[PDB]
Design an enzyme around this catalytic site. Structure first.
Site, PDB file in Angstrom:
ATOM      1  N   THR A  80      -6.824   3.577  -1.946  1.00 22.53           N
ATOM      2  CA  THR A  80      -6.586   2.163  -1.661  1.00 22.53           C
ATOM      3  C   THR A  80      -7.662   1.220  -2.198  1.00 22.53           C
ATOM      4  N   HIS A  85      -2.331  11.086  -1.338  1.00 23.57           N
ATOM      5  CA  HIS A  85      -2.557  10.562  -2.673  1.00 23.57           C
ATOM      6  C   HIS A  85      -4.068  10.508  -2.923  1.00 23.57           C
ATOM      7  N   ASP A 115       0.824  -1.212   0.000  1.00 18.43           N
ATOM      8  CA  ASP A 115       0.000   0.000   0.000  1.00 18.43           C
ATOM      9  C   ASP A 115       0.863   1.269   0.000  1.00 18.43           C
ATOM     10  N   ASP A 128     -21.206   6.460 -20.196  1.00 14.77           N
ATOM     11  CA  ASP A 128     -20.779   5.092 -19.852  1.00 14.77           C
ATOM     12  C   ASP A 128     -19.509   4.644 -20.580  1.00 14.77           C
ATOM     13  N   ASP A 134     -21.655  10.146 -26.457  1.00 15.50           N
ATOM     14  CA  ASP A 134     -21.761   9.456 -25.156  1.00 15.50           C
ATOM     15  C   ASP A 134     -22.522  10.301 -24.129  1.00 15.50           C
ATOM     16  N   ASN A 139     -24.990   9.353 -22.103  1.00 10.07           N
ATOM     17  CA  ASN A 139     -25.151   8.640 -20.829  1.00 10.07           C
ATOM     18  C   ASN A 139     -23.818   8.301 -20.144  1.00 10.07           C
ATOM     19  N   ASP A 155      -0.645  -0.418  -5.200  1.00  8.61           N
ATOM     20  CA  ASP A 155      -1.966   0.161  -5.498  1.00  8.61           C
ATOM     21  C   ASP A 155      -1.922   1.628  -5.942  1.00  8.61           C
ATOM     22  N   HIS A 156      -0.942   2.381  -5.444  1.00  5.37           N
ATOM     23  CA  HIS A 156      -0.672   3.766  -5.868  1.00  5.37           C
ATOM     24  C   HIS A 156       0.598   4.274  -5.196  1.00  5.37           C
ATOM     25  N   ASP A 158       2.405   3.104   3.150  1.00  2.99           N
ATOM     26  CA  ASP A 158       1.400   4.167   3.051  1.00  2.99           C
ATOM     27  C   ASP A 158       1.416   5.070   4.285  1.00  2.99           C
TER      28      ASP A 158
HETATM   29  C1  LIG Z   1     -15.800  -2.301 -18.322  1.00  2.00           C
HETATM   30  O1  LIG Z   1     -16.172  -3.677 -18.300  1.00  2.00           O
HETATM   31  C2  LIG Z   1     -17.492  -3.915 -17.836  1.00  2.00           C
HETATM   32  C3  LIG Z   1     -17.729  -5.424 -17.844  1.00  2.00           C
HETATM   33  O2  LIG Z   1     -17.514  -5.975 -19.149  1.00  2.00           O
HETATM   34  C4  LIG Z   1     -18.514  -3.140 -18.673  1.00  2.00           C
HETATM   35  O3  LIG Z   1     -19.675  -3.006 -17.857  1.00  2.00           O
HETATM   36  C5  LIG Z   1     -20.775  -3.808 -18.294  1.00  2.00           C
HETATM   37  O4  LIG Z   1     -21.517  -3.069 -19.246  1.00  2.00           O
HETATM   38  C6  LIG Z   1     -22.628  -3.775 -19.780  1.00  2.00           C
HETATM   39  C7  LIG Z   1     -23.299  -2.885 -20.819  1.00  2.00           C
HETATM   40  O5  LIG Z   1     -23.807  -1.710 -20.173  1.00  2.00           O
HETATM   41  C8  LIG Z   1     -23.585  -4.165 -18.662  1.00  2.00           C
HETATM   42  O6  LIG Z   1     -24.593  -4.989 -19.259  1.00  2.00           O
HETATM   43  C9  LIG Z   1     -25.918  -4.671 -18.808  1.00  2.00           C
HETATM   44  O7  LIG Z   1     -26.197  -5.358 -17.586  1.00  2.00           O
HETATM   45  C10 LIG Z   1     -27.529  -5.166 -17.103  1.00  2.00           C
HETATM   46  C11 LIG Z   1     -27.650  -5.736 -15.685  1.00  2.00           C
HETATM   47  O8  LIG Z   1     -27.013  -7.026 -15.615  1.00  2.00           O
HETATM   48  C12 LIG Z   1     -26.004  -7.301 -14.595  1.00  2.00           C
HETATM   49  O9  LIG Z   1     -25.140  -8.431 -14.821  1.00  2.00           O
HETATM   50  C13 LIG Z   1     -23.756  -8.100 -14.961  1.00  2.00           C
HETATM   51  C14 LIG Z   1     -22.958  -9.338 -15.376  1.00  2.00           C
HETATM   52  O10 LIG Z   1     -23.170 -10.469 -14.516  1.00  2.00           O
HETATM   53  C15 LIG Z   1     -22.199 -11.496 -14.832  1.00  2.00           C
HETATM   54  O11 LIG Z   1     -20.898 -11.136 -14.371  1.00  2.00           O
HETATM   55  C16 LIG Z   1     -20.835 -10.924 -12.964  1.00  2.00           C
HETATM   56  C17 LIG Z   1     -19.410 -10.519 -12.653  1.00  2.00           C
HETATM   57  O12 LIG Z   1     -19.146  -9.237 -13.214  1.00  2.00           O
HETATM   58  C18 LIG Z   1     -21.213 -12.183 -12.185  1.00  2.00           C
HETATM   59  O13 LIG Z   1     -21.475 -11.804 -10.830  1.00  2.00           O
HETATM   60  C19 LIG Z   1     -22.444 -12.912 -12.724  1.00  2.00           C
HETATM   61  O14 LIG Z   1     -22.381 -14.279 -12.297  1.00  2.00           O
HETATM   62  C20 LIG Z   1     -22.607 -12.857 -14.250  1.00  2.00           C
HETATM   63  O15 LIG Z   1     -21.855 -13.915 -14.876  1.00  2.00           O
HETATM   64  C21 LIG Z   1     -23.281  -7.395 -13.684  1.00  2.00           C
HETATM   65  O16 LIG Z   1     -21.932  -6.975 -13.879  1.00  2.00           O
HETATM   66  C22 LIG Z   1     -24.128  -6.154 -13.365  1.00  2.00           C
HETATM   67  O17 LIG Z   1     -23.697  -5.540 -12.132  1.00  2.00           O
HETATM   68  C23 LIG Z   1     -23.926  -4.107 -12.074  1.00  2.00           C
HETATM   69  O18 LIG Z   1     -24.965  -3.762 -11.152  1.00  2.00           O
HETATM   70  C24 LIG Z   1     -24.696  -4.044  -9.771  1.00  2.00           C
HETATM   71  C25 LIG Z   1     -25.893  -3.555  -8.965  1.00  2.00           C
HETATM   72  O19 LIG Z   1     -26.875  -4.598  -8.912  1.00  2.00           O
HETATM   73  C26 LIG Z   1     -23.397  -3.389  -9.294  1.00  2.00           C
HETATM   74  O20 LIG Z   1     -23.037  -3.873  -7.996  1.00  2.00           O
HETATM   75  C27 LIG Z   1     -22.244  -3.677 -10.253  1.00  2.00           C
HETATM   76  O21 LIG Z   1     -21.108  -2.892  -9.867  1.00  2.00           O
HETATM   77  C28 LIG Z   1     -22.654  -3.349 -11.685  1.00  2.00           C
HETATM   78  O22 LIG Z   1     -22.900  -1.931 -11.745  1.00  2.00           O
HETATM   79  C29 LIG Z   1     -22.267  -1.256 -12.854  1.00  2.00           C
HETATM   80  O23 LIG Z   1     -22.877  -1.549 -14.114  1.00  2.00           O
HETATM   81  C30 LIG Z   1     -24.229  -1.087 -14.247  1.00  2.00           C
HETATM   82  C31 LIG Z   1     -24.762  -1.550 -15.602  1.00  2.00           C
HETATM   83  O24 LIG Z   1     -24.887  -2.979 -15.581  1.00  2.00           O
HETATM   84  C32 LIG Z   1     -24.293   0.432 -14.077  1.00  2.00           C
HETATM   85  O25 LIG Z   1     -25.654   0.874 -14.116  1.00  2.00           O
HETATM   86  C33 LIG Z   1     -23.676   0.849 -12.745  1.00  2.00           C
HETATM   87  O26 LIG Z   1     -23.593   2.276 -12.674  1.00  2.00           O
HETATM   88  C34 LIG Z   1     -22.286   0.247 -12.558  1.00  2.00           C
HETATM   89  O27 LIG Z   1     -21.347   0.915 -13.405  1.00  2.00           O
HETATM   90  C35 LIG Z   1     -25.639  -6.465 -13.356  1.00  2.00           C
HETATM   91  O28 LIG Z   1     -25.967  -7.185 -12.166  1.00  2.00           O
HETATM   92  C36 LIG Z   1     -28.466  -5.776 -18.148  1.00  2.00           C
HETATM   93  O29 LIG Z   1     -29.832  -5.813 -17.720  1.00  2.00           O
HETATM   94  C37 LIG Z   1     -28.330  -4.938 -19.415  1.00  2.00           C
HETATM   95  O30 LIG Z   1     -29.254  -5.377 -20.426  1.00  2.00           O
HETATM   96  C38 LIG Z   1     -29.667  -4.332 -21.343  1.00  2.00           C
HETATM   97  O31 LIG Z   1     -29.010  -4.420 -22.611  1.00  2.00           O
HETATM   98  C39 LIG Z   1     -29.277  -5.643 -23.299  1.00  2.00           C
HETATM   99  C40 LIG Z   1     -28.360  -5.813 -24.512  1.00  2.00           C
HETATM  100  O32 LIG Z   1     -27.046  -5.315 -24.235  1.00  2.00           O
HETATM  101  C41 LIG Z   1     -30.743  -5.652 -23.713  1.00  2.00           C
HETATM  102  O33 LIG Z   1     -31.030  -6.969 -24.200  1.00  2.00           O
HETATM  103  C42 LIG Z   1     -31.730  -5.291 -22.590  1.00  2.00           C
HETATM  104  O34 LIG Z   1     -32.874  -4.650 -23.180  1.00  2.00           O
HETATM  105  C43 LIG Z   1     -31.196  -4.385 -21.468  1.00  2.00           C
HETATM  106  O35 LIG Z   1     -31.713  -3.052 -21.615  1.00  2.00           O
HETATM  107  C44 LIG Z   1     -26.896  -5.034 -19.921  1.00  2.00           C
HETATM  108  O36 LIG Z   1     -26.619  -6.353 -20.413  1.00  2.00           O
HETATM  109  C45 LIG Z   1     -22.868  -4.926 -17.555  1.00  2.00           C
HETATM  110  O37 LIG Z   1     -23.745  -5.093 -16.443  1.00  2.00           O
HETATM  111  C46 LIG Z   1     -21.633  -4.173 -17.086  1.00  2.00           C
HETATM  112  N1  LIG Z   1     -20.871  -4.985 -16.147  1.00  2.00           N
HETATM  113  C47 LIG Z   1     -20.136  -4.488 -15.140  1.00  2.00           C
HETATM  114  C48 LIG Z   1     -19.394  -5.470 -14.275  1.00  2.00           C
HETATM  115  O38 LIG Z   1     -20.043  -3.295 -14.901  1.00  2.00           O
HETATM  116  C49 LIG Z   1     -18.079  -1.725 -19.055  1.00  2.00           C
HETATM  117  O39 LIG Z   1     -18.857  -1.271 -20.165  1.00  2.00           O
HETATM  118  C50 LIG Z   1     -16.608  -1.664 -19.431  1.00  2.00           C
HETATM  119  N2  LIG Z   1     -16.174  -0.296 -19.647  1.00  2.00           N
HETATM  120  C51 LIG Z   1     -15.751   0.173 -20.829  1.00  2.00           C
HETATM  121  C52 LIG Z   1     -15.342   1.619 -20.825  1.00  2.00           C
HETATM  122  O40 LIG Z   1     -15.689  -0.498 -21.852  1.00  2.00           O
HETATM  123 CA   LIG Z   2     -22.834   5.742 -24.240  1.00  2.00          CA
HETATM  124 ZN   LIG Z   3      -3.656   2.475  -0.424  1.00  2.00          ZN
HETATM  125 ZN   LIG Z   4      -3.212   6.212   2.129  1.00  2.00          ZN
END
Ligand SMILES: *[C@@H]1O[C@H](CO)[C@@H](O[C@@H]2O[C@H](CO)[C@@H](O[C@@H]3O[C@H](CO[C@H]4O[C@H](CO[C@H]5O[C@H](CO)[C@@H](O)[C@H](O)[C@@H]5O)[C@@H](O)[C@H](O[C@H]5O[C@H](CO)[C@@H](O)[C@H](O)[C@@H]5O[C@H]5O[C@H](CO)[C@@H](O)[C@H](O)[C@@H]5O)[C@@H]4O)[C@@H](O)[C@H](O[C@H]4O[C@H](CO)[C@@H](O)[C@H](O)[C@@H]4O)[C@@H]3O)[C@H](O)[C@H]2NC(C)=O)[C@H](O)[C@H]1NC(C)=O
Ligand SMILES: [Ca+2]
Ligand SMILES: [Zn+2]
Ligand SMILES: [Zn+2]
Ligand SMILES: Cc1c(Sc2cccc(C(=O)O)c2)c2ccc(Cl)cc2n1-c1ccccc1
Ligand code: NA
Length: 775
Positions: A154, A409, A116, A659, A655, A657, A303-304, A256
């Site tokens: 962290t 940091h 850390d 994201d 963009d 929204n 981590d940083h 740290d």
């Molecule tokens: C960085 O990488 C990530 C991951 O690749 C990218 O983020 C992903 O972006 C996708 C597109 O927006 C999202 O897909 C949408 O998900 C909706 C909800 O579904 C959830 O399932 C997710 C996956 O579950 C699997 O994987 C996890 C491990 O990661 C396992 O646990 C499971 O076993 C599964 O195998 C899961 O990640 C999501 O979790 C989110 O919500 C919870 C709260 O309940 C938070 O605790 C999480 O942190 C996470 O929040 C983030 O993401 C949500 C969006 O999902 C944001 O709103 C938050 O602000 C926060 O950032 C969910 O539980 C689907 O319903 C949705 O469906 C729509 O679209 C489809 C077609 O695409 C249509 O058919 C439908 O009509 C519907 O409208 C969509 O599939 C992923 O959820 C999201 N995953 C993560 C981990 O963030 C990200 O884009 C990348 N960044 C860049 C810059 O490229």
């Molecule tokens: Ca977008």
């Molecule tokens: Zn730290």
């Molecule tokens: Zn610190």
């Protein structure tokens, strides 16, 4: 009831059974004899020559008896003092060509040694202060530094390592944060953080476990000292095949705490680092005596970093705002502002942003609506990220008022003081190998590769760090193109357009140096050839998705001649129905236009007329045109002069929204007044050149060199406090601030670049993740 033969057991046990695992003290749930049996301190952590060949005494913390090696619970130095062995550090560097494990071992194990606040420049102190770490670094694979994620705190960074996700995706957006849906707050100190609802993504330990790879419990109560933790990992490694874990972690809280109190460059950092190195020595000697020192992969990762930050260097919001008890501020090396009380109608974000923008001459923080933060930070798409955000200068703090440590940091992750460390030592890593800096978001994929696991969806580019590994279990594969381009000829006469406007082999081989960008989503677009540039014109968005051109070192710059300043020409290849019109730009008071290929760099006066095509035109605010015109007229030439020519792919991003991903049609929220012309939120450019700068860009044999940015498409230049002055003083520092990776633009555009080069695909993925920082 008891913990006998049960200490640090890898399984959890539900109630009503008392616990004996490594985290039971934090959950106040250990058995009465846990401290007695499992936390023995008697006679230290090191064998002495007196103790060699002792009879077994169970009160000892670690053992020096003949049977200790059979039991796997010796002290780490047992064989060094009693068998005349050498410390691991004292031995020669020897290449680990394959994993040398005992029979039973189905895979080389992974131990993550996490430190850390470990600044990257601490490694320059070397074997004088850290012998073991300098051996790991020099013998294994290492970087000059590793970029953390923002905020450089962290818990966001540690959990980014575990998941390969940005904080906005994994949900741990700071050490402290508020969730409006839960109506609850998260802190380093307290019970709330243990609630699983806060933690998103899939950390390495869950990924391992779900795919049948046993993971050694990662977390340790702070009551349990470092030596005990090292000894328990080594004891777990001695377990029988069917029980023992293949992945482990050790978190160290240093340096740290020392960094905060005495600063990064204080004399008092030496003992902290010796304590770290000592702990690493106990691991390596322990592994060596278990015959696992050429079996296990060790990752030494930070981590940083740490910066000089004194309490005298603090900004106070009470100097800028006359309402500071109407807001709640998350303070320090960053700012996050929120309404203090919910049910307060008088709170207004716009007036707060106004009151914080460019007031003092030497102002040491900059306000932002989170959607306008540089896209390289990816710090916006989470309900726990407050709309108002303050990027604080390095070496400074932001607090709310004067009535609210030498180091800190949390600053922008490009800042050199925030850079941390990475070393990979073991069979699967490369030997005596330096590798270029990379982002900590990539490591989750590597760690999955090391354990033979399929990574969960994450923000690493899988394949981008194959050059770290001796053997790769993942070979990256190019995404299939979804939308085939049309190549429409001349099929519409000039009298057939009414837009209110008034006025191929040679193209490809000079203007698409690295092949045609592939569109990875379903849409209809047209390729358009010209003498000075090539573009992929979207029929849906009425503008190029990308516009590619090339400018040699001796290429001339010209003006826009005065009779063509308002010139916009209809494109005979493109339909009126799928074309922009100049009447909208008239009727839109605030919206003007600009061109993707510059008319300022056309090869001749005749060729200049293609630059004024309606199919090269994009909507731009007068404020933005000052940035865009300076880039095109001055800087694109400047980059060609310095870098022996440059290929430039420019284009729009949408963009709304925030994201970080390409918007669909329905997600677009602003158009040119009374039209279907969508307004970009940003404009990108991918400026490529030859790394061997002596060879020109279009005659590059060896590897490539890239810069990029994602400029925010703003109605004003309030972000630039010197925007009244000439563009030579402000716009280039604006661009540098919004620098980007090619990968970020691919997320935002749904395009795939560099598809036809002479370089291997893994090497191209490294190129796509590269970030120019200007540090
Ligand atoms: C960085 O990488 C990530 C991951 O690749 C990218 O983020 C992903 O972006 C996708 C597109 O927006 C999202 O897909 C949408 O998900 C909706 C909800 O579904 C959830 O399932 C997710 C996956 O579950 C699997 O994987 C996890 C491990 O990661 C396992 O646990 C499971 O076993 C599964 O195998 C899961 O990640 C999501 O979790 C989110 O919500 C919870 C709260 O309940 C938070 O605790 C999480 O942190 C996470 O929040 C983030 O993401 C949500 C969006 O999902 C944001 O709103 C938050 O602000 C926060 O950032 C969910 O539980 C689907 O319903 C949705 O469906 C729509 O679209 C489809 C077609 O695409 C249509 O058919 C439908 O009509 C519907 O409208 C969509 O599939 C992923 O959820 C999201 N995953 C993560 C981990 O963030 C990200 O884009 C990348 N960044 C860049 C810059 O490229
Ligand atoms: Ca977008
Ligand atoms: Zn730290
Ligand atoms: Zn610190
Ligand atoms: C609960 C938790 C915590 S909280 C914790 C961890 C270790 C020691 C202590 C202590 O108070 O001594 C506290 C946590 C921290 C970091 C990470 Cl990456 C993860 C962390 N997780 C976590 C979350 C979900 C699933 C598994 C672990
Ligand atoms: Na106008």
């Amino acid at each position: 009831g008891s913990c006998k033969g049960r200490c640090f057991e890898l399984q959890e046990v539900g109630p009503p059974d008392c616990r004996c695992d490594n985290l039971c003290k934090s959950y106040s749930s250990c058995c009465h004899d846990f401290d007695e049996l499992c936390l023995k301190t008697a006679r230290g952590w090191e064998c002495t020559k007196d103790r060699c060949g002792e009879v077994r005494n169970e009160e000892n913390a670690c053992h020096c008896s003949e049977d200790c090696l059979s039991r796997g619970d010796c002290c780490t130095n047992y064989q060094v003092v009693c068998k005349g062995e050498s410390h691991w550090v004292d031995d020669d560097c020897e290449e680990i060509k394959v994993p040398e494990c005992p029979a039973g071992f189905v895979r080389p194990p992974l131990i993550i040694f996490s430190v850390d606040g470990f600044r990257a420049s601490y490694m320059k102190k070397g074997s004088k202060v850290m012998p073991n770490i300098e051996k790991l670094r020099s013998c294994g694979t290492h970087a000059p530094y590793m970029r953390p994620v923002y905020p450089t705190k962290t818990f966001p960074n540690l959990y980014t390592l575990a998941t390969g996700l940005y904080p906005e995706s994994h949900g741990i957006v700071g050490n402290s944060m508020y969730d409006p849906v839960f109506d609850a707050s998260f802190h380093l100190r307290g019970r709330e953080k243990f609630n699983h609802r806060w933690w998103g993504g899939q950390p390495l330990w869950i990924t391992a476990t779900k795919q049948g790879v046993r993971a050694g419990t990662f977390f340790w109560s702070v009551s349990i000292p470092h030596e005990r933790r090292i000894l328990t990992i080594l004891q777990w490694l001695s377990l029988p095949d069917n029980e023992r874990p293949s992945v482990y972690a050790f978190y160290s809280e240093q340096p740290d705490f020392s960094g905060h109190k005495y600063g990064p460059f204080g004399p008092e950092m030496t003992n902290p680092l010796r304590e770290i190195d000592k702990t690493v020595g106990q691991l390596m000697d322990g592994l060596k005596q278990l015959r696992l020192h050429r079996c296990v992969n060790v990752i030494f990762v930070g981590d940083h970093g740490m910066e000089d930050v004194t309490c005298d260097r603090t900004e106070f919001l009470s100097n800028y705002l006359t309402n500071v008890d109407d807001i709640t501020l998350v303070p320090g090396t960053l700012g996050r502002i929120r309404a203090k009380s919910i049910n307060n109608s008088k709170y207004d974000p716009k007036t707060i942003i106004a009151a914080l923008t460019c007031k003092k001459p030497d102002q040491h923080f900059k306000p932002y609506m989170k959607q306008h933060l540089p896209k390289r930070l990816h710090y916006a798409n989470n309900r726990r990220i407050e709309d108002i955000h303050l990027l604080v200068d390095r070496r400074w703090h932001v607090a709310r008022k004067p009535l609210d440590f030498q180091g800190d940091h949390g600053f922008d992750n490009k800042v050199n003081s925030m850079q941390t460390v990475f070393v990979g030592y073991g069979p699967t890593f490369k030997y005596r190998t330096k590798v270029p800096p990379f982002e900590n978001i990539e490591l989750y994929n590597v760690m999955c590769d090391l354990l033979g696991l399929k990574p969960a969806p994450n923000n690493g580019t899988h394949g981008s760090l194959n050059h770290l590994l001796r053997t790769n279990t993942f070979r990256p594969t190019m995404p299939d193109e979804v939308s085939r381009p049309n190549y429409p000829g001349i099929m519409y006469l000039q009298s057939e357009f009414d837009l209110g406007c008034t006025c191929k082999g040679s193209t490809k081989e000079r203007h698409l140096l690295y092949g045609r960008p592939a569109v990875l989503y379903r849409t209809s677009y047209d390729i358009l050839y010209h003498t000075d540039f090539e573009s992929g014109y979207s029929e849906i968005f009425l503008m190029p998705l990308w516009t590619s051109y090339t400018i040699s070192k001796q290429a001339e710059v010209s003006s826009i001649p005065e009779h063509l300043t308002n010139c916009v020409r209809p494109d005979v290849r493109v339909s009126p129905g799928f074309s922009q019109n100049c009447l909208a730009y008239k009727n839109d008071k605030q919206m003007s236009y600009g061109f993707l290929f510059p008319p300022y760099l056309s090869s001749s006066p005749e060729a200049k007329y293609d630059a004024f095509l309606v199919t090269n035109m994009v909507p731009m605010y007068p404020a933005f045109k000052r940035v865009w015109a300076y880039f095109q007229r001055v800087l694109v030439k400047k980059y060609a002069s310095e870098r022996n020519g440059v290929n430039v792919i420019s284009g729009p991003i949408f963009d709304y929204n925030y994201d970080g991903l390409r918007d669909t049609e329905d997600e677009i929220k602003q158009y040119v007044e009374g039209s279907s012309i969508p307004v970009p939120t940003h404009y990108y450019s991918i400026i490529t050149s030859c790394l061997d700068f002596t060879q020109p860009a279009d005659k590059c044999d060896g590897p490539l060199s890239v810069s990029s940015f994602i400029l925010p498409h703003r109605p004003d230049n309030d972000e630039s406090c010197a925007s009244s002055e000439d563009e030579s003083k402000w716009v280039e520092e604006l661009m540098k601030m919004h620098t980007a990776r090619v990968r970020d633009i691919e997320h935002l555009t749904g395009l795939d670049f560099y598809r036809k080069t002479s370089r291997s695909y893994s090497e191209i993925l490294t190129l796509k993740t590269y970030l120019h920082t200007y540090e």
